[PDB]
Amino acid sequence: HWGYGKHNGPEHWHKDFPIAKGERQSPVDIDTHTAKYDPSLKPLSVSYDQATSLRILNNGHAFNVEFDDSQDKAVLKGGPLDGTYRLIQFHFHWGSLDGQGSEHTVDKKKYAAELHLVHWNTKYGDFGKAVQQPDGLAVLGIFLKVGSAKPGLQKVVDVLDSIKTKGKSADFTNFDPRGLLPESLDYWTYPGSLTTPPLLECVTWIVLKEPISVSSEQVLKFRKLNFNGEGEPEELMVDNWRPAQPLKNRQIKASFK
Ligand SMILES: CCCSc1c(F)c(F)c(S(N)(=O)=O)c(F)c1F
Ligand SMILES: CCCSc1c(F)c(F)c(S(N)(=O)=O)c(F)c1F
Ligand SMILES: [Zn+2]
Fold first, then answer.
1. How far does the centroid of ligand 3 lie from the alpha carbon of residue 116, in Å?
2. Which residues surround ligand 3, an ion (CB under 5 A)?
3. Where is this site: Fine-tunes the proton-transfer properties of H-64?
4. HEC sequence for 149-204
């Protein structure tokens, strides 16, 4: 029964998930001036040409676009990673207002939303055993700013009225996540956690420097979704972000500058 409300939001999560106060929690503020350029970081390899989306689901916290992760189709590697990480799903976090919504911040700046492309390390054989490992996941985070529309996002936007409420799903095939990327793959990276319960400390975060633009209308449609189930009073799905957590002497490493 955790959520994003006054009574069950991020400041309460520690009572059911005590690692909320752990040593490598996410998100964090990215101090750009203190991030360390690491010339030995490799370019990120995003190989999404064979991706197979399957379904979109309103899970009552966000919506997930799900992929077939039963073979190496869409994979992430390179960058700071060892080995190969398979795309399982993506989702977003967003605000009630354009001035908020992202989980990570950049010099305390908040973006209107943040996209998370979640990948699990193939050496652990599937997702549920990967989340138990300290290098189990790689999450590619991409900031969203409001401006010109992102035409690769519109297929997601348009399906949302079919998954308005918690537990609804819809077929969602042939969606190409390459259309959600910015032009540059420059990034920051650090070791962290899931940003939702169970808050497990299993994630290598890779946060792109370059945001994508989405239109006002696109993010407005995200804000029409509901946290509640059908036949319950409406609770708009907004402000589904965890605030920045203590860095606790982790170093954020930059691939650029
Ligand atoms: C007004 C009803 C809230 S009951 C409750 C809660 F308060 C929590 F903090 C959580 S938590 N710690 O998971 O956020 C929880 F699961 C709950 F069920
Ligand atoms: C095991 C928890 C449910 S799946 C999941 C996840 F894998 C994430 F990486 C994230 S995130 N936000 O850390 O990318 C997330 F929110 C999730 F819900
Ligand atoms: Zn997320």
1. 5
2. 116
3. 4, 59, 64
4. CCHHHHHHHHHHHHHCCCCCEEECCCCCHHHHCCCCCCEEEEEECCCCCCCCCCEE
